[PDB]
Design a protein around this motif. Structure first.
Motif, short mmCIF file in Angstrom:
data_model
loop_
_atom_site.label_atom_id
_atom_site.label_comp_id
_atom_site.label_asym_id
_atom_site.label_seq_id
_atom_site.Cartn_x
_atom_site.Cartn_y
_atom_site.Cartn_z
N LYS A 110 78.63 -39.03 -66.65
CA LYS A 110 79.95 -39.60 -66.31
C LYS A 110 80.33 -38.98 -64.94
N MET A 159 90.89 -41.46 -65.15
CA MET A 159 90.35 -41.27 -66.52
C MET A 159 91.39 -41.32 -67.64
N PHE A 160 92.69 -41.52 -67.34
CA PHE A 160 93.72 -41.58 -68.38
C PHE A 160 93.80 -43.07 -68.83
N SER A 185 87.43 -43.51 -71.21
CA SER A 185 87.07 -43.47 -69.79
C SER A 185 85.55 -43.32 -69.47
N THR A 204 83.26 -37.36 -71.54
CA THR A 204 84.34 -36.42 -71.85
C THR A 204 85.40 -37.21 -72.59
N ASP A 205 86.29 -36.51 -73.28
CA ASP A 205 87.22 -37.17 -74.17
C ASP A 205 88.45 -36.27 -74.41
N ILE A 206 89.64 -36.80 -74.10
CA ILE A 206 90.93 -36.16 -74.40
C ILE A 206 91.78 -37.07 -75.31
N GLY A 207 91.47 -38.36 -75.34
CA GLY A 207 92.21 -39.30 -76.20
C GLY A 207 91.32 -40.33 -76.89
N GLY A 208 90.00 -40.15 -76.75
CA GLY A 208 88.97 -41.05 -77.26
C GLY A 208 87.93 -41.49 -76.24
N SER A 209 87.95 -40.90 -75.01
CA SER A 209 87.05 -41.30 -73.93
C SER A 209 85.53 -41.30 -74.12
N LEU A 246 90.53 -31.04 -74.30
CA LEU A 246 89.52 -31.92 -73.72
C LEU A 246 88.17 -31.44 -74.26
N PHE A 349 101.68 -35.30 -71.51
CA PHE A 349 102.67 -35.53 -70.45
C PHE A 349 103.87 -34.59 -70.51
N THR A 456 98.56 -49.19 -75.42
CA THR A 456 98.52 -47.71 -75.59
C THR A 456 98.44 -47.26 -77.03
C1 LIG Z 1 89.83 -40.26 -72.31
O1 LIG Z 1 89.82 -39.48 -73.49
C2 LIG Z 1 89.66 -39.20 -71.16
N1 LIG Z 1 88.66 -39.05 -70.33
C3 LIG Z 1 88.88 -37.99 -69.53
C4 LIG Z 1 90.11 -37.55 -69.83
C5 LIG Z 1 90.83 -36.48 -69.27
C6 LIG Z 1 92.23 -36.40 -69.46
C7 LIG Z 1 92.89 -35.24 -68.90
C8 LIG Z 1 92.12 -34.28 -68.15
C9 LIG Z 1 90.72 -34.44 -68.01
N2 LIG Z 1 90.13 -35.52 -68.53
O2 LIG Z 1 90.61 -38.29 -70.88
C10 LIG Z 1 91.10 -41.14 -72.24
C11 LIG Z 1 91.23 -42.02 -73.54
C12 LIG Z 1 92.31 -43.07 -73.31
C13 LIG Z 1 93.60 -42.43 -72.81
C14 LIG Z 1 94.77 -43.21 -72.93
C15 LIG Z 1 95.97 -42.64 -72.47
O3 LIG Z 1 97.14 -43.38 -72.55
C16 LIG Z 1 98.35 -42.90 -72.84
C17 LIG Z 1 99.49 -43.22 -72.04
C18 LIG Z 1 100.74 -42.71 -72.46
C19 LIG Z 1 100.85 -41.90 -73.63
C20 LIG Z 1 99.72 -41.57 -74.42
C21 LIG Z 1 98.46 -42.09 -73.99
C22 LIG Z 1 96.04 -41.33 -71.87
C23 LIG Z 1 94.85 -40.52 -71.76
C24 LIG Z 1 93.63 -41.10 -72.26
C25 LIG Z 1 92.35 -40.28 -72.15
#
Ligand SMILES: *[C@@](O)(c1ncc(-c2ccccn2)o1)[C@H]1CCc2cc(Oc3ccccc3)ccc2C1
Ligand SMILES: *[C@@](O)(c1ncc(-c2ccccn2)o1)[C@H]1CCc2cc(Oc3ccccc3)ccc2C1
Ligand SMILES: [Cl-]
Lengths: 547, 542
Positions: A110, A159-160, A185, A204-209, A246, A349, A456
């Motif tokens: 990645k 990546m968010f 991401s 990598t994954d912080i929310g399911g990436s 993360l 956030f 979201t």
């Molecule tokens: C992934 O999990 C992802 N990939 C890299 C990262 C990351 C985040 C912070 C620091 C370093 N790397 O995260 C994403 C999965 C989808 C997603 C969706 C949202 O949307 C969102 C908006 C408002 C409130 C809650 C969620 C945010 C972050 C991710 C991470």
């Protein structure tokens, strides 16, 4: 003032174009020297067998590398998953430690995995033309294990996002259907591995990436406990946020590949290169266990209505596990809305999005990010007011907006303590039912391009496990049938807000697309998580394993 | 507005008095029934020997229990280290798992280790009459290992102190000299074990709280990496601060006891009870290794001038290590002022002390805390202005003050990332010198009572390793000589501010008091740290 952003895109596109041309030349040079090589046979070998043939000398590292390089270049034509060719890899190929557990294995990375001489743009203009000066720890360990990192793959801007477009390299497309997102991401990884262009990658994954692109593209992926692997040298657009952990992990065509990658990474080289990582060796006996399991399960989290395909994938996996002698126990982590709205959202956030927003100064905002940047830029008082207005009809939207407000360090400590208590509360629930593992739905089928940014709420299935910091992986188990797809017309969502309306349309037109389930275990139980994923894969797709 | 606080103190003193009376009654009854028992022989047995005799059946759990109970009761007379007798221990004694690695071993617990039916007051009125619903995880594990937790030991009020007094149970005194502090915050443990009243205890440490009392009382202590052991059920007064992790660990008379305690705690029982703890078993082969070491060392941190005894203890240990075949490499972690003033101070007080101060609302402020509460109470603009004014003459005071100010979550993320990067910086510095371990001075001899609270700067030797989250333990290596003590009269400090002035006076009249050194290893290298501590112990106390 968009000339800075335009210049960065022009330069990034020239570098990506030059990279692909360099790959094409190397692939053509190799193919002329090897006309009798059975490329399809080599490309379809499961990773374990590819590794065995490389270790014995039956296949040379050159044959393996150049054949995968040719496949990556070809699949990239319809997917746009590759941003950069890691040019020095051909020198690494000749120096690959012979007894290394991943000797001669080409590995895709990645874009955020720092690789010497290459940018980790994250699709942001501010990071274009700022090459890394050293390989991140996991890349050093991959090389020490004989692997050959060969490409950097695309990510959605910052990546968010669980989509995969940025203004520098453009949009990555799902290899199964061009109108669909590959997820994100780690979307570039999902598209590349999912189309056969790489036998193993890291995401990598912080929310399911790791999980979204693995599920959307029909491959396996594991998100370990946050600190099981080294995050040293990983480029991110926000640093120092620790409430929502993360994690980095493998992505591959089968579960055995994920286990081999984890075993190779969990070695003395990693533990000495990054002493902050607990030196927990891969427990083979746990992974190889054939003992019956107590499997907790849920068919819905009551937050994101599952698509008909998700619900069937879950029910069928549950039934095959029951037929195989495992105990299936209904289980739902308590307070999911609170974990997502207050803990996860607030954790990501806590500063109102200020640190994140600095990255966008003078840049284009990719359309795949939806209104995220517009929403975050709103003054705290206005997010509070708009939240109060939204509350009676759209409580989910009101709750996310209220929890995306800046706060003091005092309030962050309170939130951090609530995360710790919430983690123990779910562990207590798990222990009270004596679970070994947990089976959940996984978001799917792949959403239409540009819709993840407008849905979201759908992070509910994956983000809950970043909040809890539990290992969680995904396994493809079925494909969307026309029956499942026609059933999307009856889909309403639980809230009926904009996120449900978007999700309903976005998951339509998905016949033949892959659908996964999610497997979870307690913190530090990656081997048990993988043992369960291996079980799911064997029961749902027996051809993927030695038969 | 101290009625609630006065009532809490009256009830605490009643319960402490009744606990000690219950102990005495149980002890006198056992002694009447067993007048032939060699109590002095049993008490002087090193823990490993005690464990062996308990396992073989040569000593009964009853004999060991009541003998240590009597000794704890006796030593408490001159130290005031015991806050509560853990009543049900006689029931645990009879039901102790026979095959447990700590079978029949009486264990003392710092007051913050939650114990079913007992308060964990932390010396705070707000926590009085709030009994724990259950034993914390480590206590459950000790019991599963056959140990017998028998007492709660005193702490300074709130535990944000390296002295040992609170308005509920009063002041704990060093068993070596009554005018001296036993150290803190695990002061009750230090005074109890240090006087022979317990063979093994558990303490906690965020700025040196295991290390200060072990050094001040002449015993061994280990502060592991923060997440090596479970903190589930530990009573604290500030929650959610994760920049500087809290650690818990053993205190005992020798290094072997610390290694046994860790070995006993790092079992499937702990890992199952608290899945958030990485399941790292005790690596016996690392602990037992006898390979020559590359030992980094420093005589001073250029922040707290060592007392002559501290400097001598360090130099002698370095010389004995070199004579035994180890390589001694001059090494000092970079940017110690920043690690202490910005990262450590900022990490502990990111919210300006508001969460901490909540605990003191309507309470007395123990004199041992000095001006900490008064300073934290100052408005942010005032801490800022006062820091600006102090900066030209007393930069150390000014830097701590400015970093005790509240801040946003945005600034806390920045500080957390700076802590991570500083940790990687020192790790890189360490690896560049190819170190295995690090030998440092350890604050000593014991300061006079009520002086740790006025000598903040002296946490430099210990707090550096909480900031870096490296395992660090202490070993007594010498005692203060007439010469060491005379040389203290020429002590100046590097800053000449109030903290250096106090330290010189606070360390006066210390002839015969124990002095330690500190042993450090990289994160998760508790086994190596203990192997190094064993080496120091073998050389310095043969
Ligand atoms: C992934 O999990 C992802 N990939 C890299 C990262 C990351 C985040 C912070 C620091 C370093 N790397 O995260 C994403 C999965 C989808 C997603 C969706 C949202 O949307 C969102 C908006 C408002 C409130 C809650 C969620 C945010 C972050 C991710 C991470
Ligand atoms: C101990 O390390 C100790 N014991 C228990 C705890 C603790 C702290 C937070 C949450 C739970 N437990 O800590 C103490 C060693 C000495 C000490 C000194 C100071 O002083 C100070 C004042 C101003 C700025 C920096 C340091 C603070 C904390 C401790 C902890
Ligand atoms: Cl950890």
């Amino acid at each position: 003032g968009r000339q800075k952003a335009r210049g960065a895109a022009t330069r990034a596109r020239q570098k990506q174009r030059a990279s692909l041309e360099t790959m094409d030349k190397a692939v053509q040079r190799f193919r002329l020297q090897n006309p009798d090589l059975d490329s399809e046979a080599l490309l379809t070998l499961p990773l374990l067998q590819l590794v065995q043939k490389l270790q014995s000398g039956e296949l040379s590292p050159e044959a393996v590398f150049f054949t995968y390089l040719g496949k990556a270049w070809e699949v990239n034509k319809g997917t746009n998953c590759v941003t950069s060719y890691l040019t020095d890899c051909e020198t690494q190929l000749s120096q690959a430690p012979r007894q290394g557990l991943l000797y001669g294995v080409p590995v895709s990375l990645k874009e955020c995995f720092s690789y010497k001489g290459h940018d980790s743009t994250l699709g942001l203009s501010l990071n274009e033309g700022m090459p890394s000066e050293s390989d991140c720890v996991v890349v050093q360990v991959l090389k020490l294990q004989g692997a050959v990192p060969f490409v950097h793959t695309n990510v959605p801007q910052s990546m968010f996002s669980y989509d995969c477009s940025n203004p520098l390299f453009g949009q990555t497309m799902n290899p199964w259907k061009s109108s669909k997102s590959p997820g994100g991401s780690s979307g570039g990884e999902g598209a590349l591995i999912g189309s056969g262009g790489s036998p193993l990658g890291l995401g990598t994954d912080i929310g399911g990436s790791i999980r979204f692109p693995s599920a959307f593209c029909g491959i396996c992926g594991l998100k370990p406990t946050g600190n099981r692997l080294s995050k040293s040298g990983l480029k991110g657009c926000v640093y120092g946020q620790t409430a929502v952990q993360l994690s980095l992990g493998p992505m591959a065509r089968d579960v055995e590949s994920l286990a081999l990658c984890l075993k190779a990474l969990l070695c003395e080289h990693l533990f000495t290169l990054d002493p902050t990582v607990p030196p927990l060796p891969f427990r083979e006996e746990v992974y190889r266990s054939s003992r019956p399991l107590r499997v907790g399960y849920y068919e819905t989290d009551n937050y994101t209505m599952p698509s008909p395909a998700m619900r069937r994938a879950l029910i069928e996996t549950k039934q095959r596990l029951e037929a195989a002698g495992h105990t299936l126990i209904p289980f739902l982590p308590n307070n999911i809305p609170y974990a997502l709205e207050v803990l996860s959202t607030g954790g990501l956030f806590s500063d109102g999005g200020r640190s994140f927003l600095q990255n966008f100064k003078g840049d284009f905002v990719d359309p795949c990010l939806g209104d995220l940047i517009l929403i975050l830029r709103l003054p705290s008082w206005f997010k509070r007011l708009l939240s109060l207005l939204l509350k009676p009809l759209f409580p989910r939207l009101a709750a996310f907006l209220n929890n995306m407000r800046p706060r003091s360090a005092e309030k962050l400590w309170k939130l951090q303590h609530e995360i710790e208590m919430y983690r123990q509360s779910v562990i207590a629930q798990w222990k009270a039912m004596n679970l070994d593992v947990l089976l959940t739905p996984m978001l799917g089928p792949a959403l239409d391009l540009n819709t993840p940014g407008r849905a979201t709420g759908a992070v509910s299935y994956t983000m809950l496990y970043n909040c809890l910091d539990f290992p969680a992986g995904v396994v493809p188990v079925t494909t969307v049938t026309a029956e499942d797809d026609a059933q999307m017309e009856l889909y309403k969502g639980y809230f009926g807000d904009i996120w449900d309306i978007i999700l309903k349309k976005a998951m339509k037109n998905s016949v033949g697309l892959p659908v996964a389930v999610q497997c979870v275990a307690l913190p530090w139980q990656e081997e048990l998580c993988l043992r369960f994923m291996r079980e799911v894969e064997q029961l749902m797709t027996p051809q993927k394993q030695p038969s």
